[PDB]
DNA sequence: TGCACAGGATGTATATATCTGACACGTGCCTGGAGACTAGGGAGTAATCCCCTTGGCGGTTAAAACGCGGGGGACAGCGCGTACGTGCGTTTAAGCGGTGCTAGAGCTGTCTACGACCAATTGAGCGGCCTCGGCACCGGGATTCTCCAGGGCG
């Protein structure tokens with residue numbers, strides 16, 4: 536979810552981010568895909584919308 | 585001699601004159617009915633401001649909700665005996681008729697304290713405020729307080 540687990544976690548596992556709906560994306564939505572892209576990812580991140 | 589009868593000698597409901605009690609009707613003096621003047625208390629309005637809502641997403645917590653074991657307490661059954669229920673005779677005392685009283689209950693003038701009604705002052709009491717020492721909540725630790733397992737004892 537956006538507010539619960541889409542804010543501070545470390546997950547490096549997924550290579551893809553999917554967004555069903557985005558209300559605010561100056562910042563708040565940018566954090567969601569940045570939960571995916573991290574230091575431990577050696578693969579390019581493909582982010583859809 | 586045993587017996588029926590004709591009339592008196594008592595009862596008894598029956599019908600008549602008589603004694604309370606309560607409804608019904610005819611008054612006149614403290615009530616109501618009503619007319620006019622004053623006026624302040626009630627009906628009506630103009631802001632107002634002020635706390636009280638509008639509508640619904642999520643995240644999380646504390647409180648509400650459900651589920652089972654069983655332990656003890658509600659609860660049915662049943663025997664006992666003494667404690668009132670029921671029935672007599674015997675007594676003390678209230679009900680009631682009647683009486684002599686009085687001392688307190690009950691309606692009415694006097695005036696006189698004495699409280700109702702109305703200006704003038706103010707100060708003690710109410711709106712406003714802003715602090716700190718008592719209060720709210722919880723840790724530390726000692727203390728008590730109940731729960732469960734032998735075992736020494738039946």
Ligand SMILES: [Mg+2]
Pocket residue numbers: 543
């Ligand atoms: Mg961080």
